[PDB]
């Protein structure tokens, strides 16, 4: 409800990109709009380097980078669809990486929004049909569907 989700918070990211490239691409609209501090991306990669967020779900791997809420000015989400699977370390203590193709960058400063959005994500990435749609839909349609179900 108090979460800011705009059309330009959805991006398709091309082939040659690394973990740090994705975090910087997804953070870019949030910093431009003032939703986070200027070094928010640094704080995400640092946090990702020590506390991974790769979720090894089928059919498509998912990651959910974020940092401490003190670095968030206003609640927002940024979404990346990866043309190629980029590896993320497993959020649950594995060496086997997670081939991620969907990235949910969370920039939430409010704890009650954080748990609700994580709850929603857990339900959504167990919906194979939905995850399948995210790999074919365009940025506008991805924005429309996600904007609908996080309205509620």
């Amino acid at each position: 409800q108090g979460i800011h989700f705009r059309r330009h918070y959805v991006r398709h990211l091309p082939k040659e990109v690394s973990q740090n490239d994705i975090i910087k691409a997804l953070a870019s609209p949030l910093i431009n709009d003032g939703m986070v501090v200027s070094d928010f991306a640094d704080h995400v990669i640092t946090r990702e380097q020590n506390f991974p967020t790769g979720l090894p779900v089928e059919p498509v791997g998912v990651a959910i980078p974020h940092t401490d809420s003190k670095y968030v000015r206003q609640n927002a989400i940024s979404v990346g669809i990866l043309a190629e699977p980029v590896n993320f370390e497993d959020a649950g203590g594995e060496p086997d990486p997670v081939p991620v193709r969907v990235v949910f960058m969370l920039a939430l400063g409010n704890w009650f929004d954080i748990t609700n959005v994580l709850w929603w994500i857990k339900a959504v990435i167990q919906d194979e049909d939905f995850m399948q749609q995210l790999l074919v839909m365009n940025d506008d349609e991805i924005y429309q569907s996600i904007y609908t179900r996080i309205s509620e």
Partner: antibody
Amino acid sequence: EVQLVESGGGLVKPGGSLRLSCSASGFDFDNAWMTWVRQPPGKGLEWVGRITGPGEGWSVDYAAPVEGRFTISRLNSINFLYLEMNNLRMEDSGLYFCARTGKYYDFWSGYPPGEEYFQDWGRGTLVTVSS
Amino acid sequence: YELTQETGVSVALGRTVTITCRGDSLRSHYASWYQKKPGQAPILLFYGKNNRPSGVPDRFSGSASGNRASLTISGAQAEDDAEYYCSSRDKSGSRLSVFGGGTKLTVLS
């Protein structure tokens, strides 16, 4: 290193009001959630209320017997937490603890809004309601 | 009480003992566990699925199933003789918190 020094407890009349303070040190207080807990005479710990941080607009929640009579506030510039107790009742008597409050949510098994837990406690300030 | 705990439990020194917290909100929420001695501030022992604060003896372990949360003390010591409180949400999805009634743990001397 963490200290939570409560004060303001003492004798107060039913129907009256009393303000409790707690002075916190040794942690990032600006971003910390803070909780009051009380121990009535001869009973166990009782959750009283909790104030959140800036990301939540400092919203407060209260225990049922206390809602509408107690007000929790904070002044972050001086690392103080406050409990303002109005319309005091005999059963408000007890030892009042201030507690630094953590937040927990497990992704795969969690349910919103997760759980709060009390990672550092003061020694409490004693309140006696009596006419 | 929304969370029910045994009133008192005895354990022989060096033996293992489990105390329990039970309630509907535990089907959706984890519990945290506290130790309190007469006249002293409570201390956090365990919370969440498997989190023990540094400085807490690793003989304290929490677990959970159904409407039940357990704290197990492997090899009880005389310094463990204390009161134990559980805490969790008062109802599933609630922003409020609540404590169980406390268990008096006696380490037989």
